[PDB]
Amino acid sequence: XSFXXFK
Amino acid sequence: XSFXXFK
Amino acid sequence: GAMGSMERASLIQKAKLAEQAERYEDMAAFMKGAVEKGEELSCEERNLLSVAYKNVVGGQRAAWRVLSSIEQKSNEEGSEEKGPEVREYREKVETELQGVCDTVLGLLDSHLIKEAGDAESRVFYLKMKGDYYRYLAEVATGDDKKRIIDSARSAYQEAMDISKKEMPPTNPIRLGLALNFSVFHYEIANSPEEAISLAKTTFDEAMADLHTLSEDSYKDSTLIMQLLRDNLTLWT
Amino acid sequence: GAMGSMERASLIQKAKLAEQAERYEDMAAFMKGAVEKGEELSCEERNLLSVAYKNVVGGQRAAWRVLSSIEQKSNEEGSEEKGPEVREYREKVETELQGVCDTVLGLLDSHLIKEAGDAESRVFYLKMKGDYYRYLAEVATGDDKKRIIDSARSAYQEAMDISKKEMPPTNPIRLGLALNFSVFHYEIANSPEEAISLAKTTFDEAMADLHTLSEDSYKDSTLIMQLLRDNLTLWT
Ligand SMILES: [Mg+2]
Ligand SMILES: [Mg+2]
Ligand SMILES: [Mg+2]
Ligand SMILES: [Mg+2]
């Protein structure tokens, strides 16, 4: 699991 | 609902 | 010429690989190349052609609908002016969709339909011709809307006439044709009663022919019959 | 120049529309155009850049993995020879993936990184530089594999050093950076122990900083912390 999406 | 995938 | 230097069989092999990889633009380009070799297409090959362009135009239609909805909201009472961008980008997507439809129609006209002598191949291609004019109709707003709609209707009608004479009521191409012509009537031609009548008659005549079928053909036919019922449940 | 004639703000507006439409190639081209205007990117704009290329390269990576798996099976005992097509098509997809990675790296090098003075922007871009070298590393097999891997490691390390000095342990960019550097260690660098150690330390130090946060920041941070735990559950 990677994380490339912010909020 | 349409149908465009046969088998 | 794009694919002019690749073997027909290699283009077919790569179309199947692209389907597995969910690379449908690639799939379509490979199948376009295969068609342009000039030989008729087998049943499996016609399927690959249809699946490829269904997925390409399907993504374009979904995007166009998103953008059209945004554009329509922009043209309501109370909506602040946001400038030309939404219309411009909707037009960009619409133009590429139209180009894809035009490409498929060109393949049908040069020369898939005229060489298709067997009922199954000729109905398959005429159904596609109706489908891709229907997609053009979904976005048409100007002088040619009526002619585009009539072109879809005409293709579907010729396919229906052949399918009725030459194929059993449970044939999957006959059933998918009738399903989509019914969708044309409901969504494009402002004829919901015709859409409902066609879907009902199609379903009932297939039901009465299921007894003739093997277990595998019964599975194929009842799958499409369920889509007719789903539409009837939505429309009534 | 592709997008050279469009206003910066219009490119940003159209990138947001393309995201809504799930048109991520379009999204990326619009954001590439915005970057090429030469101004630094805001926080929201950096996000749009990352989301766009994440989705484009994500579809390419998924296709490459499908095709690589097929190719590997083709090179087993008992597998009939199918000719060059699987390798050719894998190479086609690989080349387009590499081109996308090269495009992003070019944007980072010309001139996003050198103008990024704030911790948040500089770490964001260095994380991207590590990510896109990692994607190049996933497909690398020749003379430059080791240098590609070291380029990813170096970018990630510089980002980690800045994030440790300049950002709290719960900062979402710091956390996503550590997550991805941990994935690099596990999947690319054959260093699963380092991957596990980094994920654990990252999680525990964020846990101990959650008390400082608002409800909204706590939601943002704990979302990424769960991905660290998911990896640890997979890896141990
Ligand atoms: Mg030949
Ligand atoms: Mg013939
Ligand atoms: Mg300007
Ligand atoms: Mg600066």
CATH of residue C137's domain is 1.20.190.20
Give the 3-state secondary structure of chain D: CCCCCCCHHHHHHHHHHHHHCCCHHHHHHHHHHHHCCCCCCCHHHHHHHHHHHHHHHHHHHHHHHHHHHHHHHHCCCCCCCCCCHHHHHHHHHHHHHHHHHHHHHHHHHHHHHHHCCCHHHHHHHHHHHHHHHHHHHHHCCCCCHHHHHHHHHHHHHHHHHHHHHHCCCCCHHHHHHHHHHHHHHHHHCCCHHHHHHHHHHHHHHHHCCHHHCCHHHHHHHHHHHHHHHHHHHHHC
> Which residue from D228, D227, D210, D229 is spatially nearest to D219, judged by alpha carbons?
D210
CA–centroid distance, residue D217 to ligand 1 (Å): 62
- Give the distance from residue B4's alpha carbon to the nearest chain C alpha carbon, in angstroms: 6
Q: Is residue D138 part of a domain?
A: yes
Rg (CA), chain C: 19
Which domain does D88 fall in, by range? 8-235
Given an 8 Å threshold on Cβ–Cβ distance, is A1 in contact with D47?
no
Q: How far is CA D201 from CA C17, C115, C162, D213, D226, in A?
A: 42, 68, 70, 19, 14
The secondary structure of residue C191, as a DSSP letter, is -
- Give the distance from residue D128's alpha carbon to the nearest chain C alpha carbon, in angstroms: 25
Cis peptide before C111 (omega within 30 of 0): yes
Written as one letter, the residue type at D150 is D
| Cα-based angle D118, D122, D124 (whole degrees, multiple of 5) | 120
CB C15, CB C52: distance < 8 Å: yes
Q: How many CB pairs under 8 A join B and C?
A: 35
CB C18, CB C27: distance < 8 Å: yes
Residue D160 structure tokens: 């980690």
CA C6 to chain centre: 27
Query: Which residues of chain C lie closer than 8 angstroms to D10, CB-CB?
Result: 83, 85
> Which residue from C163, C203, C151 is spatially nearest to C179, judged by alpha carbons?
C203
Q: How far is CA D45 from CA C67, C89, C141, D40, in A?
A: 21, 19, 35, 9
Contacts (Cβ under 8 Å, ≥6 apart) of D178: D160, D163, D198, D199, D202, D228
| Resolution value (Å, 1 decimal) | 1.8
Place of tokens 């990630």: D156
Q: Is residue C157 part of a domain?
A: yes
Q: Is residue D145 part of a domain?
A: yes
Cis peptide before D111 (omega within 30 of 0): yes
CB C173, CB C120: distance < 8 Å: yes
In chain A, the N- to C-terminal Cα span, in Å, equals 19
Given an 8 Å threshold on Cβ–Cβ distance, is C17 in contact with D88?
no
Q: How far is CA C145 from CA C72, C105, C112, C137, D45, in A?
A: 19, 16, 25, 6, 40
Written as one letter, the residue type at D11 is L
Cα gap B3→D192, rounded to integer Å: 47
Structural domains counted in chain C:
1
Q: Is residue C28 part of a domain?
A: yes
Ligand number with the minimum distance to the CA of C40: 2
CA–centroid distance, residue D115 to ligand 4 (Å): 4
> Which residue from C219, C222, C169, C228 is spatially nearest to C195, judged by alpha carbons?
C228
Q: Is residue C29 part of a domain?
A: yes
CA C150 to chain centre: 16
Query: Which residues of chain D lie closer than 8 angstroms to A4, CB-CB?
Result: 50, 53-54, 57-58, 131, 180
Cα gap C126→C113, rounded to integer Å: 7
Residue D161 structure tokens: 């050093």
| Core vs surface per residue C51-84: b (16+ CB within 10 A) or e | bbbbbbbebbbebbebbbebbeeeeeeeeeeeee
Cα gap D142→D140, rounded to integer Å: 6
- Shortest CA distance from C8: residue in chain D: D85
Q: Is residue C201 part of a domain?
A: yes
Rg (CA), chain D: 19
Q: At CB < 8 A and 24+ separation, what contacts does D75-79 make?
A: none
| Cα-based angle D21, D27, D32 (whole degrees, multiple of 5) | 170
- Shortest CA distance from C15: residue in chain D: D89
Cα gap C87→D31, rounded to integer Å: 19
Residue C106 structure tokens: 């060109």
Q: Is residue C42 part of a domain?
A: yes
Torsion angle defined by CA atoms of residues C64, C70, C72 and C76, in that order, rounded to the nearest 10 degrees? 180
Cα gap C22→C20, rounded to integer Å: 6
CB C26, CB C6: distance < 8 Å: no
Contacts (Cβ under 8 Å, ≥6 apart) of C219: none
CB B6, CB C47: distance < 8 Å: yes
Question: D78: phi > 0 → left, psi -120 to 50 → alpha, else beta; which?
Answer: left
| Backbone phi and psi for residue D59, each to the nearest 5 degrees, phi listed first | -65, -35
Given an 8 Å threshold on Cβ–Cβ distance, is C85 in contact with D21?
no
CA D29 to chain centre: 17
Q: Which of D55, D66, D73, D89 to mutate to test the interface with C (most CBs of C within 10 A)?
A: D89
CB C98, CB C139: distance < 8 Å: yes
> Which residue from C27, C33, C26 is spatially nearest to C6, judged by alpha carbons?
C33
